[PDB]
Amino acid sequence: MQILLANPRGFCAGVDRAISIVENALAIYGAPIYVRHEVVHNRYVVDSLRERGAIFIEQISEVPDGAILIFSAHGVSQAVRNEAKSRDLTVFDATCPLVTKVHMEVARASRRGEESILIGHAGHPEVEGTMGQYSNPEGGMYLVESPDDVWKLTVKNEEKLSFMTQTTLSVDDTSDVIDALRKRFPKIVGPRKDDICYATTNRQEAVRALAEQAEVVLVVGSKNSSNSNRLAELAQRMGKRAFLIDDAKDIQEEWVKEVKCVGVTAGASAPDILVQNVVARLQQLGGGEAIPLEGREENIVFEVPKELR
Numbered sequence: 001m002q003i004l005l006a007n008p009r010g011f012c013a014g015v016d017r018a019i020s021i022v023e024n025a026l027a028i029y030g031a032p033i034y035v036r037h038e039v040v041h042n043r044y045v046v047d048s049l050r051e052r053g054a055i056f057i058e059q060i061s062e063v064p065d066g067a068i069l070i071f072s073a074h075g076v077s078q079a080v081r082n083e084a085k086s087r088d089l090t091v092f093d094a095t096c097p098l099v100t101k102v103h104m105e106v107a108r109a110s111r112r113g114e115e116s117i118l119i120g121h122a123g124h125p126e127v128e129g130t131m132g133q134y135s136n137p138e139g140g141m142y143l144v145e146s147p148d149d150v151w152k153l154t155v156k157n158e159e160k161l162s163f164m165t166q167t168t169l170s171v172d173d174t175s176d177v178i179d180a181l182r183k184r185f186p187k188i189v190g191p192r193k194d195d196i197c198y199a200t201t202n203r204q205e206a207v208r209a210l211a212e213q214a215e216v217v218l219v220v221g222s223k224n225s226s227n228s229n230r231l232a233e234l235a236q237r238m239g240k241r242a243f244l245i246d247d248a249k250d251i252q253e254e255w256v257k258e259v260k261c262v263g264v265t266a267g268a269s270a271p272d273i274l275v276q277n278v279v280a281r282l283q284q285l286g287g288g289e290a291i292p293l294e295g296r297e298e299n300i301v302f303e304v305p306k307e308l309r
């Protein structure tokens with residue numbers, strides 16, 4: 001059995017920054033450090049940080065007075081940010097710059113009381129945060145997940161309309177939603193393409209190349225990771241068996257019995273150690289040295305705020 005690694009894979013710049021923010025705050029201020037939502041959607045990272053004294057919470061009322069609070073990489077609504085601001089709390093924001101950029105566009109629309117449509121998945125924290133930057137009752141802020149959702153949407157003034165996307169969507173499915181938005185609302189304004197981040201686009205392109213060669217693909221990432229789910233879904237749609245796994249333990253031997261070529265990737269929130277352990281497990285089940293595919297080079301880094309160095 002040949003083992004191939006997708007390239008790129010694993011940590012992006014927003015995730016490296018956000019985890020560093022929590023680590024550094026723990027180092028500087030000691031436990032506990034409070035964090036709104038899992039800092040990133042990875043059980044191993046979160047379990048780790050919890051064992052070192054991070055406490056993960058969904059509401060600001062769960063955080064005591066005088067504390068340090070960090071917002072997760074997925075971002076937060078204005079109501080949450082203002083709720084935290086009114087309190088004695090010390091707040092650090094681990095929201096990814098690429099999320100923040102979308103937030104600002106939503107807030108601009110809100111100020112203009114002009115309506116905005118977000119493409120994303122209901123209930124995901126990034127979606128809550130992004131919808132959560134719009135407040136003007138005279139405009140509106142609508143969520144669509146599919147072309148059918150677009151086909152049934154009505155808005156108050158379709159002459160003044162803009163769209164935004166979640167950063168971790170399917171590139172291809174999103175393309176279909178946007179095509180529908182433009183057929184329905186010819187005057188709609190957005191970005192050139194979408195708000196899907198470089199890391200999501202690149203990992204999707206890499207798993208496409210991986211799945212052209214592999215019979216079976218293993219995506220390292222947690223169940224509640226949107227971007228990781230998209231990598232598995234992509235592979236499956238190409239006719240390959242794909243499995244989303246937290247770690248090497250989850251590999252069932254039947255999945256790779258008599259498979260000549262197995263591919264491994266990782267979502268943007270999955271640490272490289274988990275991939276290394278996956279490869280070691282595949283080698284036990286009879287695989288050779290892991291071969292990295294040629295891939296697009298990523299060079300973007302996001303620094304921690306200076307107060308957390």
Ligand SMILES: O=P(O)(O)OP(=O)(O)OCc1cccnc1
Binds near residue numbers: 042
């Ligand atoms: O569920 P997803 O959003 O894929 O979060 P995860 O933490 O798996 O990946 C990092 C991230 C954070 C913020 C925005 N987009 C991606």
Ligand code: SF4
Binds near residue numbers: 015096098099167
């Ligand atoms: S996957 Fe994208 S938007 Fe999300 S933390 Fe990473 S770089 Fe930022």
